[PDB]
Amino acid sequence: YMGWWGHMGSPPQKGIAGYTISPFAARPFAGVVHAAIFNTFRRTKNQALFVILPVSFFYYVWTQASEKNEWLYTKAGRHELAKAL
Amino acid sequence: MTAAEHGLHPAEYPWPQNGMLSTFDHASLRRGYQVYKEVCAACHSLDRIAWRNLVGVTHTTDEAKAFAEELEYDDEPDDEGNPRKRPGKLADYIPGPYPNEQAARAANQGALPPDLSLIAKARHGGADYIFALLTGYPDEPPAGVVLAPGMNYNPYFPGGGIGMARTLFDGVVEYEDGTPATTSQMAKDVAAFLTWAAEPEHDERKKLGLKAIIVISAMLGLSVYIKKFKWSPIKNRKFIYNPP
Amino acid sequence: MTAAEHGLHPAEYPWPQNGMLSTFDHASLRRGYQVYKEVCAACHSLDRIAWRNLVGVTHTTDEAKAFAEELEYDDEPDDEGNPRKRPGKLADYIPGPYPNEQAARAANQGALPPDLSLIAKARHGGADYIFALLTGYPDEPPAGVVLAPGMNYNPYFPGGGIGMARTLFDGVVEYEDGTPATTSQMAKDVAAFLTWAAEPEHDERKKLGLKAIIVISAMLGLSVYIKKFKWSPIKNRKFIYNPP
Amino acid sequence: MALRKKNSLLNMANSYVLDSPQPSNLNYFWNFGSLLALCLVIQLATGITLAMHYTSHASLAFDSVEHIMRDVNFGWFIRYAHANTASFFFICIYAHMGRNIYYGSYKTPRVLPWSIGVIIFLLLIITAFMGYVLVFGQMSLWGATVICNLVSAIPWLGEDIVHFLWGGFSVGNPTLQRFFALHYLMPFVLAVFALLHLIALHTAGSSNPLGITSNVDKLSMHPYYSFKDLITVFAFLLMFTLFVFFSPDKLGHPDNYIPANPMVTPASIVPEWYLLPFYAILRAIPDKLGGVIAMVAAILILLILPIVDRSIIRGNAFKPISKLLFGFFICNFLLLGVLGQVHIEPPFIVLGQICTIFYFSYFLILLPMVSTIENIFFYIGSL
Amino acid sequence: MALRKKNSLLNMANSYVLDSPQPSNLNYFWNFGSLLALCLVIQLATGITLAMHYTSHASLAFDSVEHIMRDVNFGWFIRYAHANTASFFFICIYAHMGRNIYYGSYKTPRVLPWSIGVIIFLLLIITAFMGYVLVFGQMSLWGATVICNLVSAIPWLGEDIVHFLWGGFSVGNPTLQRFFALHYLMPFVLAVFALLHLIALHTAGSSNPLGITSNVDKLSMHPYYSFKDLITVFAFLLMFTLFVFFSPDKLGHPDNYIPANPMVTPASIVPEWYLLPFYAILRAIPDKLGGVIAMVAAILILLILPIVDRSIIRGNAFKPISKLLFGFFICNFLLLGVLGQVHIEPPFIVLGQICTIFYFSYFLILLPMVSTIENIFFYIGSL
Amino acid sequence: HLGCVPIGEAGDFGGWFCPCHGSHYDISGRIRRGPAPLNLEIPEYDFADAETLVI
Ligand code: HEC
Ligand code: HEC
Ligand code: HEM
Ligand code: HEM
Ligand code: HEM
Ligand code: HEM
Ligand code: FES
């Protein structure tokens, strides 16, 4: 499923003209400030829910479990600990 | 587990060596050696440290040779194969108070005082734990605690009952630099000294780390410029499609 | 080099163990242990051999336990950490006559008697060299030889002057099996025993080697048949050429 | 013809590092492969150097490590580099495997590099476990004891196998000397399998974040990915520097600075952090043999991803529900890690069981269901 | 298409061991390559097993070898197998190199496999030398001392390099521990170079005893050469058996059963037999640096055989004068071996110098002259 | 010569006599008779005190 240069396995290409300029002719950091602020914000905003939802859920589960565990091993939690074992 | 079974967590004290760019205070290291030698060394060994290790850290070559030369160490047997002793040399290790574990336990009501050469790395908390433990013996155990015989209450020690009694009291040591030897001062110095004993490369390591951080950061910045420079023909590529 | 600098080469004696299929004579091994124990062990150690090693080779479990139990070995310290002794066990190594090299040399006019556990492998000649050396002290050194002080003439020893005097004389040992203990008999037995001490796997090794030789030979023969069988179409190939 | 193409030896290197045709759109998560190669090179260089100073005998092992720290020039650095790079190796391998799962790198035609990859991961675990024993501190000994006793669960012959592994009746000198020899060997085996998974990959080439063919638009590996790899190399070296020089023991257990003592048992015997999720899975099953099987199955179940993913599309870039499920699976894997080092107490016992069920149900239920439904939504939604 | 051809991993094995097209007329001297592979496999298996029981610390090394002989189950066999197979490895490598020189395997187009082969031979020497030191008997120590002091001849920095190699001011514990680590590593490096010389060879294929192309008449490697290799494998195993089980110490030095003692010097310090010709060459030159250069040149001069052989025909099968010269060269090499272990006394001092001149003049004078004249005799003689 | 240790006080120049091939060293440890080519090498030594030398 992959060939090599000259016979890579692409379907026939026709009709596309491609253009580019030399690395010495270009400014490598052109538009960097716009990218760093606006592009990153767009990309991050669109992925935020997929990170926030599972992270917030599993952090909450952990927080509840760790606080209960802590409370069961205090004096106040003696009775509830006895039942839990 | 109950908090008592864990032990109370020591405070974070501001040690001189805390700080990416900070060395030990060597004057504190020297004073801490003196607390080790006059208090701890009665029960605790420091077996990983040789006299040469003190030289240019806490002591000059001559001071350390003098400490070594006051002791006797086992020599090679004489010509009839009978045992002999020699005076100590800089290559010799600092000798411990007891010949074996059994002797150590017999002198400490069954408890074995650990070797202190790695203790700052072998306990959670490091210098802070050593400082907290040495200064944290309350006059009276909290009401209701029943100590086993030969145990002392110390909240920092897991379970609360430690076989080591309080040993640092105001003026047990007379420092040679005129520093007031209060319990807190002695605990701070000896904790610093023990931290040095556990990690004697500390000062050099952090300086080499500063050099590495600087070089690696500059190389990271330049590698970004170079990657962007080389990639710009691909990033900037444009197409015109005319469907055949 | 002079022949004297090399030492005279020992004869090839017909040992029972010479022979692809031959074990040691275990009765000779047992007698040789008794010569070791009563003569050699005054100056020479056998440190690589434990009491358990004798069991089922020269002695029963009970005999070897009895030899071990007659000796005292260092135990772990007692509860006050003071040294203690225990009786020997089968796991213990046979103890040597001297505490260190310096003591050994002092007892032997400066010479150090080697440990005998590997001596049969550590000398050209093996059992033959040990036999030749022990039986090869002439009554008088050849005219003109000047021995250094504390040296004895023995032609098998390189240079001729050995620090070990003759030790085997008719009837120094009384064998427990009634064998006449002549110099030659004792030398033969102790050389056999020392050969066993150097290579205790000898008997098993040669029997496993017999099994391997047989299997490998059969496999070699069959591999020839199979190679010829598979190659015959290539070997038998014929051509008719008609030039185009 | 250029020499790099004509000469067969040069041409092999050329095919992998220079003319190798890559997709033009690999993102930074395709950089973990070269980071893993870097970790392997660092571990070989530091590990062989430590072997020049380390003594495998139980009477001297722990002290030989202290001699390395104290007397050998730069020994502290070589030791800390080796110990920290073991953690970095696992961070990079989890990242590389997470990349592979998110982007569908396990799907045809890349089942073979993925399946060999799962064996690489097993070899890394064994390698790291044996290396940790070599210090012969308290965690070294007690970790070896409890992990090697899991083999006792194998029916009939289990106890015999354990005594055979130990070379005696408990973890001791024979076990330490054999772990040294195997710890030295296993990285070479690991390098061979790493090479095998790349040769297997070379038939399809790298996948790419869009999940489509890149046969339409290829870039040479060099100079593009060479220079893009340098960025993450220097980022990695910055993280390496912060741990090795400024916090060398942050990732370790203080008990490993106490010499092994078969009499005293440490308060809590846990594996190194990177093994913790598998330990939580084992705890979840009450049966000994059950637990061992579950723990092994948790790794071998990666082999069925090619089957249980029923999607007609490779990778998650365009699959919102699959991306949510993947997010939950990853966070659950981190929670399992945390639960691997808590005490066996309420309420973490039940929580560990629920997380274990979630872990397995991802492979067996959720991914097959979600991938089926998304197939239908793509078809109907675009009609 | 058959799976062995279609799958890229299987196809690599297939290309080397199964469908690999071989000349149909290889004689039994083409069997040393597979014997060398067998020796390498035995040395890896026995060596890794010895490493599980050996302790590299100078206070325990010699005794750990005695523990292997005495206490480890079958330890005597594993130790004797490892020590004897080191000698067999050199017998097979000299046979393989002799085959290559007689049949012109170094000529185009096989210069690259031959040149990598010369490095394989250097790595085998280093590997074997370091392994011999590990016993830490008298020959171990004194051989290490004398051989490592040859580096002192390097001008300006030589002494510093020696102290750096030793890790101190004499051969001692630091040297032994580093030799252990390098002795374990070097066989893996050797296996890689062995693989490289085969991949380089695969472009031309094996040469054959007639020296002509075999492209006209090929046979699959399997089953023909597989079954022909079994014959020499079983012949080798018979020789192995006779030494390992019936005469395990015939090839060794008794002084290596005495523990290293830096005070007492052994009567004669010689290398293992397979290094003896190179030691005779070194003794022949009176200058220290001269001697070291000559000794290294004696191996590196193999790299010029492709140039100094001016024959238009590959190999010696049809060249009576070249066959006589080759016979003298081989016997001279064996005499150099013998002279490597005699005492430095008359008349062996001068004899060693004459044999050394003959050794070098084969490459520099005789083979270029004889191969030139035989070219003319073939042309004129067949007109 | 080869590298045995000479027995001191013995000899013929009453310094050191190597028993191996019979080479005689002097009270300076100079070679006088026998196969040995050179005088016994001198290490690098300094008198730190008048009662102790370091080598
Ligand atoms: C006369 C006895 C004695 C003196 C003096 C002494 N110790 Fe100890 N120390 C012990 C004993 C006994 C233990 C073991 C206690 C136990 O395990 O219950 C111990 C334990 C410790 C521990 C380890 C506690 C732990 O977490 O395991 C540290 C740290 C310590 N000592 C430091 C010091 C320092 C620092 C000094 C003095 C400056 C000191 N000790 C003086 C007897 C002593
Ligand atoms: C009382 C002293 C003494 C007794 C008894 C003794 N030896 Fe020795 N033996 C020595 C000394 C001393 C040497 C060292 C001689 C030397 O190196 O010059 C030695 C050396 C040897 C050597 C090695 C010679 C060599 O090649 O280096 C062998 C073998 C040997 N003894 C065996 C025996 C056996 C077998 C017995 C008795 C059955 C025996 N010895 C009894 C003192 C003794
Ligand atoms: C994938 C490669 C490797 C990994 C993941 C790895 C992992 C580890 C780990 C976790 C340890 C314990 C470190 C500590 O806490 O002190 C260790 C120790 C060790 N490793 Fe490795 N290792 C690898 C390769 C090697 C190699 C190739 C060698 C070659 C011998 C080696 C030699 C050692 C030695 C001698 C130790 C013990 C000394 C010490 O603890 O630092 N390692 N290794
Ligand atoms: C020593 C450990 C490893 C090394 C050095 C390594 C190295 C690499 C490299 C360099 C690549 C190509 C570049 C890249 O995509 O990042 C790659 C691709 C891959 N690796 Fe690994 N790898 C290792 C472990 C693993 C593991 C554990 C797995 C799977 C469980 C794996 C599965 C894959 C797959 C599927 C690909 C193809 C991904 C794609 O391009 O779509 N590898 N690896
Ligand atoms: C080309 C492969 C090898 C060769 C030629 C070789 C050669 C040698 C030699 C000559 C010795 C001295 C043997 C003796 O007289 O006792 C030796 C010892 C040793 N070798 Fe190797 N060896 C090789 C591979 C290995 C490997 C891969 C290991 C893995 C660690 C290894 C481990 C050892 C050990 C531990 C010893 C010392 C114990 C002993 O002497 O038997 N060797 N080797
Ligand atoms: C570990 C050591 C070695 C191994 C396992 C090895 C293995 C092999 C094998 C299997 C072959 C193909 C079959 C054959 O002709 O016997 C071969 C061919 C060859 N080897 Fe080696 N080899 C080793 C060392 C060397 C050395 C030291 C040299 C050269 C100095 C060398 C030069 C060659 C050459 C030139 C060929 C091609 C000969 C031909 O077929 O005409 N090899 N080797
Ligand atoms: S060894 Fe000193 S005289 Fe020959």
With beta carbons less than 8 A apart as the criterion, state whether F26 and F19 touch. Answer: no
For residue B232, list chain A residues with Cβ-Cβ distance below 8 A: 21, 23, 26-28
* Coil, helix or strand at residue F32: strand
H-run or E-run covering E227: helix E221-241
Residue F8 CA to ligand 2 center (angstroms) comes to: 25
Query: Is the CB of E40 inside a 6 Å radius of any atom of ligand 6?
Result: yes
With beta carbons less than 8 A apart as the criterion, state whether B56 and B215 touch. Answer: no
Q: Which two tokens stand for residue C160?
A: 């001729």
Classify B7 in phi/psi space as left (phi over 0), alpha (psi -120 to 50) or beta: left
Q: B93 - beta bridge partners?
A: B50
Q: Which long-range contacts (CB under 8 A, 24 or more apart) does D359-367 make?
A: D359/D281, D359/D298, D359/D329, D359/D332, D359/D333, D360/D297, D360/D298, D360/D301, D362/D325, D362/D329, D362/D332, D363/D301, D363/D304, D363/D305, D363/D308, D364/D308, D366/D325, D367/D305, D367/D308, D367/D309, D367/D322, D367/D325
Alpha carbon dihedral E136, E138, E142, E143, in 10-degree steps, equals -70
Residue C49 CA to ligand 2 center (angstroms) comes to: 18
Runs of H (alpha helix) within E285-366: 288-300, 305-308, 320-339, 348-361
Q: Which two tokens stand for residue E284?
A: 């022949």
Amino acid at C163: G
Identify the residues whose C-beta falls under 6 Å from ligand 1.
B 35, 39-40, 42-44, 108, 111, 113-114, 116, 119, 123, 130, 133-134, 157, 162-164, 167-168, 190
How close are the terminal C-alpha atoms of chain D, in Å? 52
Q: Which two tokens stand for residue C161?
A: 């002057």
| Ligand (nearest to CA of E36) | 6
Residue E233 CA to ligand 6 center (angstroms) comes to: 16
Closest CA to E66 of C64, C39, C93, C208: C93
With beta carbons less than 8 A apart as the criterion, state whether B220 and B172 touch. Answer: no
Residue of C6, C9, C43, C116 to test ligand 2 pocket, by largest number of atoms within 8 Å of CB: C43
Q: Which two tokens stand for residue D369?
A: 């269901």
Residue of E22, E36, E121, E302 to test ligand 6 pocket, by largest number of atoms within 8 Å of CB: E36
Indicate which atom in ligand 4 lies nearest the CA of residue D29: 16
For residue E146, list chain F residues with Cβ-Cβ distance below 8 A: none
Helix, strand, coil % over all residues of chain F, rounded to 5: 0, 25, 75
Q: Which two tokens stand for residue E247?
A: 């005469």
Q: Which long-range contacts (CB under 8 A, 24 or more apart) does D190-193 make?
A: D190/D40, D190/D120, D190/D123, D190/D124, D190/D127, D191/D40, D191/D44, D193/D116, D193/D119, D193/D120, D193/D123
Catalytic positions of D are: 202, 206, 228-229, 272
Residue E141 CA to ligand 7 center (angstroms) comes to: 20
Q: Do A73 and B3 count as a contact with CB atoms less than 8 A apart?
A: yes
| Ligand (nearest to CA of E114) | 6
With beta carbons less than 8 A apart as the criterion, state whether A10 and B237 touch. Answer: no
Give the integer Cα–Cα distance in Å for A71 and D1: 76
Q: Do E177 and D48 count as a contact with CB atoms less than 8 A apart?
A: no
With beta carbons less than 8 A apart as the criterion, state whether D311 and D301 touch. Answer: no
Give the integer Cα–Cα distance in Å for D192 and D172: 31
- The answer to whether E265 faces chain F, any CB pair under 8 Å, is yes
Exposure b/e, E361-370, CB count within 10 A at least 16 = b: ebbeebbbeb
Residues 109-148 of C with CB under 8 A from E: 114, 118, 121-124
- The answer to whether C212 faces chain E, any CB pair under 8 Å, is yes
Q: Which two tokens stand for residue D227?
A: 């220079």
Q: Which of D8, D51, D188 sits opposite E188 (nearest CB)?
A: D188
Counting the structural domains of chain D, the total is: 1
- Active-site annotation holder among F21, F27, F28, F39: F21
Closest CA to D86 of D234, D187, D193, D233: D187
Classify D211 in phi/psi space as left (phi over 0), alpha (psi -120 to 50) or beta: left
Q: DSSP letter string over E125-185?
A: HHHHHHHHHTT-BHHHHHHHHHHHGGGGGSTTTHHHHHHHHHTSSSSSHHHHHHHHHHHHH
Q: Which of A15, A20, A73 sits opposite B236 (nearest CB)?
A: A20
Residue B79 CA to ligand 7 center (angstroms) comes to: 26
Q: Report the structure determination method.
A: cryo-EM
C109 Cβ neighbours under 8 A, 6+ residues apart: C149, C150, C163
Give the integer Cα–Cα distance in Å for D352 and D281: 7
Query: Is the CB of E22 inside a 6 Å radius of any atom of ligand 5?
Result: no
Containing structural domain, residue D344: 1-383
Question: What's the Rg (C-alpha) of chain E?
Answer: 23
* Coil, helix or strand at residue B86: strand
| Ligand (nearest to CA of E194) | 6
CA angle E97, E101, E107 (to 5 degrees): 115
Q: Which of D8, D188, D199 sits opposite E200 (nearest CB)?
A: D8
Q: Do E57 and D60 count as a contact with CB atoms less than 8 A apart?
A: yes
The response to whether F18 counts as a known ligand-binding position is yes
- The answer to whether D112 faces chain E, any CB pair under 8 Å, is yes
Q: D271: cis peptide before it, omega within 30°?
A: no
Q: Which residue has the tokens 């209960």?
A: A68
Top residue of B49, B219, B232 to mutate, by most chain D CBs within 10 Å, is B219
Q: C161 - beta bridge partners?
A: C153
Indicate which atom in ligand 5 lies nearest the CA of residue E134: 37
C140 Cβ neighbours under 8 A, 6+ residues apart: none
Resolution (Å units): 2.3
Residue of E89, E94, E100 to test ligand 6 pocket, by largest number of atoms within 8 Å of CB: E100
Q: Which residue of F has its CA nearest to E268?
A: F2
Q: Is C221 exposed, middle or buried (0-12, 13-18, 19+ CB in 10 A)?
A: exposed
Q: How far apart are the CA of D286 and the nearest CA of chain B, in angstroms? A: 21
Q: Which of D203, D320, D323 sits opposite A1 (nearest CB)?
A: D203
- Active-site annotation holder among E34, E64, E87, E206: E206
Q: DSSP letter string over D145-172?
A: HHHHGGGGGSTTTHHHHHHHHHTSSSSS
H-run or E-run covering C132: helix C127-134
With beta carbons less than 8 A apart as the criterion, state whether C101 and C113 touch. Answer: no
Residues 103-132 of C with CB under 8 A from B: 103-106
Query: Is the CB of E210 inside a 6 Å radius of any atom of ligand 6?
Result: no
H-run or E-run covering F2: none
H-run or E-run covering E28: none
- The answer to whether C208 faces chain E, any CB pair under 8 Å, is yes
Runs of H (alpha helix) within E52-74: 61-70
